[PDB]
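Dear support,

We are seeing what looks like truncated structure output for some complexes. This example has four components. We would appreciate it if you could run it in full and send us the complete token output so we can diff it against ours.
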Amino acid sequence: TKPFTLPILTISEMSNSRFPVPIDSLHTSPTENIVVQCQNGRVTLDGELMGTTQLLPSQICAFRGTLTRSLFNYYWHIQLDNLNGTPYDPAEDIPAPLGTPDFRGKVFGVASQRNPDSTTRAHEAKVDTTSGRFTPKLGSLEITTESDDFDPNQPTKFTPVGVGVDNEAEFQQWSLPNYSGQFTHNMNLAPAVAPNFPGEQLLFFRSQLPSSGGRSNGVLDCLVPQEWVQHFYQESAPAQTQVALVRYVNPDTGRVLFEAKLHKLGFMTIAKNGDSPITVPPNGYFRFESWVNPFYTLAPM
Amino acid sequence: KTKPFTLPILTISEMSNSRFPVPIDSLHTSPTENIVVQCQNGRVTLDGELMGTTQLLPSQICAFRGTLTRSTSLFNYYWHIQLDNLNGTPYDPAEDIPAPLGTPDFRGKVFGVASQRNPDSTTRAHEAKVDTTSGRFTPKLGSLEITTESDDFDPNQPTKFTPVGVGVDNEAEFQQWSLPNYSGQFTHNMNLAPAVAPNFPGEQLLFFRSQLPSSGGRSNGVLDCLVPQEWVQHFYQESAPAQTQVALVRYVNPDTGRVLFEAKLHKLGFMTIAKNGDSPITVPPNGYFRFESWVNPFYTLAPM
Amino acid sequence: KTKPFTLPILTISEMSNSRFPVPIDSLHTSPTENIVVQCQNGRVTLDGELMGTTQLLPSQICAFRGTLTRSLFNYYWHIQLDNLNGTPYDPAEDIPAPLGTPDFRGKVFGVASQRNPDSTTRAHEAKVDTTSGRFTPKLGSLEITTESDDFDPNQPTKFTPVGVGVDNEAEFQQWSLPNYSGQFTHNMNLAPAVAPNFPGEQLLFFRSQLPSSGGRSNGVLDCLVPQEWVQHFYQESAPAQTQVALVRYVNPDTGRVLFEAKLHKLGFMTIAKNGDSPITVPPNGYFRFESWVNPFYTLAPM
Amino acid sequence: TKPFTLPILTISEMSNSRFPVPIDSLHTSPTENIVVQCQNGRVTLDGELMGTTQLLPSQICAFRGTLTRSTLFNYYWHIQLDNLNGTPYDPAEDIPAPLGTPDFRGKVFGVASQRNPDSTTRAHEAKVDTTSGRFTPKLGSLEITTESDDFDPNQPTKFTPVGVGVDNEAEFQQWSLPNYSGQFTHNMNLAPAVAPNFPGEQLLFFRSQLPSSGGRSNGVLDCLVPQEWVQHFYQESAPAQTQVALVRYVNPDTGRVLFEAKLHKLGFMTIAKNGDSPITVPPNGYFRFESWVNPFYTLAPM
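Here is the complete output from our reference environment:
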């Protein structure tokens, strides 16, 4: 039986599993009034990926495909391939192509092309996940660009940079988009998570994304960092119980700072009340202690 | 009871470039006798020691943070960047590294997006280029210069740079095997990771190759790394003791259950194969590298 | 007509040192054959061109502003330097270092102060070792040392210079310039060294005795020209008719001249005197421009 | 007849005339509910110093004198004050207090330093409480407070001002003159108070934000004219042809005029503005004299 382990990583050595950016802080909040069903960064403790989660850190909210013709007022239609470059099969039991953004808003980035004659071009672009032509489950999506310099029918890649909404309220990180437009409803979704113990809230790995304009704070929370996605997938260690007891330890000090539950479906809960950051020392790290049952009472923070 | 050395089980489509935040596109071998191979990113020993400017975060390779200002003296607008380490400290040049971790390790222009968020929460982001051959590219001294087409940048504001691809006009301006001058022309490069080369007849370096995006021109954007970023992270975590200077590795197809080729994974973090000429090494989509055994340096690899 | 050259009418007790924010204490002459006098603050041409790290504000000499981050005065702090603007200093300007940067080897003693966005404040004594390997002002940073640990990181910090803070006198070398870029590169864009170009002449200095936080340091600091002359020449920019302006120290009570001196175009004075000696002046006397002369003019001794 | 001129100075090239710090901004405000009578930085346009105003930028809120013992900043010390030039202070002089005495109520935070005949030196943080009953500089003495007990009695002592040192913001009152003679008598020989005298006009202030040793004090200090103007007018002594000089802030980058103001004979400015508000100026702009004018001039609103 292979033991369960966490990688030894510092707050500044973790990457967001819903975006190609580093983790900036730890955060907690009540979550009764939101649905926490993100589809990227979703993995079980025994290394089973769920939702649209994949392994490549740079490919979260990115895409590959072929461009066609349809202030960012130039509209382009993207026929989506898999991030392999292999053709995307909508019949596959997944909500959308792996790496598809799992929130409502506009993903700001750069679309680039390389033609057979070796000519190239790349310009800023936005992916509106709220538009009726955001149908990646059907195999296509729409980008908008400020530039007209794009050649139709050429292979196109998208590099995510941050959020590109105009008003803060258009970015809702806890509202899944319609992966099929309004043709049909979302399917094959990774389960939604919630704390299930009195006085416990979710613990989030928080990033602040770049913003192309407006006053969007670009706050994106993920349940588990991308390195844990990659680590559990490699290890595939059998989950002994539903809950893993984890502790944040300071190697400078020897002291433990707080304890937490790491649940089998891939999320963390702590004993705290209110929307608040969790300030941690620069050398601290999460450490696996043992398998424990859901009725464990954590020391409050 | 000696902790065994391992490679993560990753297919070709599951690896990331360690010199740029992009997926690996192919495997490639090439003669390098006439060139010096000394990249500074993606440099790790098999027992988990990072070298050069290598760090763990995949997105921070060729990215930077700091404070933007207008420079003292078609991408026209010039901006000066006082460089911060990732934690938000200013970069202290007294540290024994060639440059801030993740600083580009090639000659050319890095094309990306510079973004700002002001204390009153106003934001902006526009395309930008980092010329690593500019005389004001002195990251070791704590500064660099970006070029932009837009003028919408507030000075004295925190600024991030996300790298997307090459930005040179003429393909020959991108020299992936030519180091930049980390201190400009004021002093020489320091604390470099050592250069690598095959030390056996009939052997060539094996590269993990990516085709970076390009903002224009005919640049193929070819970037070779010695080792994927996932092996950098894995070896750092494992730190398994290196039994010898060479680890024998085999590329196995798990459906066939048969090895396609074998290679030497050297202790300093680079691979060699028994092959002559510049050529891609095509592999099945489910194949992956596997550690076979520690060997002596004079082990003879099967050809190809 | 041609705009005439003038000196401000100022008494000895109405002049400020141009290398430190203190009043001028006395006049002094000294043989300088075996040293290189090349100070960077208080460097101005007679026709109003500033040189070195010289600027106009008297309080900003050996002061600085920036952001403090962490790194018996035993607490070390990293200072990311800003211009008086608030924006980081650009190392690409053709100056030796940020304007006002100290131009001597030793420790500057002062007070570092902070004011945070929530309006909370703190201030404590600090020292600036201009010989430290981490004194890299030209690169945009330096290292302060404090006895108090009460300093918030990532907060705007000012430094008010008070005086010397060396332990033994020999650490203070007023005529030894620091390495503005640490040991990464050598000093550049320096104002030229100065020396008398005539037999029997010595440099004339405006001398101040800086406060000292401890030890036996005399705190002696000599500037070539007071800060008021820096500000005056910059405003007037009168054309220099020759390389030497004859200048006379006059007593307005008695109407008599006490001595004469050469005010050179590069911005320094020489007198016909031998040996290390103070120059005693009446409390109401002052320098006054007499005429432009040729370099081979012979000053009356003393 | 010598014409009246202003020095060509930028916002960032001006010093506060009530404290040895640079000017940070321009400000305006209604002043009906305060007495604007501040004694430092008081000069007439024809070059006459008033109040406790002197020439040296570093000596505002500073003192020289002899220290002796008397009775957290625990240690109390008595200062027998000399003049800033080391000359004995005469309380019969027709001035409010020794030149450079603070002209506000609060605590001046700085460093007291000593150098002894045997060349031993000390320097530590110190505060001058101008509201204390033993703050009697007109009588020739004040009291400092220190946290360090390392001071030698009967030794020459200097004081370098750094900023404010009150605990609560309300202790610092920049528009309340201290009692230069304690409560033994009232203030004498004061520079006159100023106020706008035209409809829609308010005073224009040169504003700095002083460092603070603690608490949440904003350390905001307003002066009527910058110290460089005090020095320039003293040098020029140009005849004031009328009571009001018309002055315009011009942008050399664009050649355009941004606002105009009245510069009054007693040394203060008024603008056509309403409400407490900063006056934002471009970095290269400067004040330019236009002509002499009468008090009934109507300024263009801002």
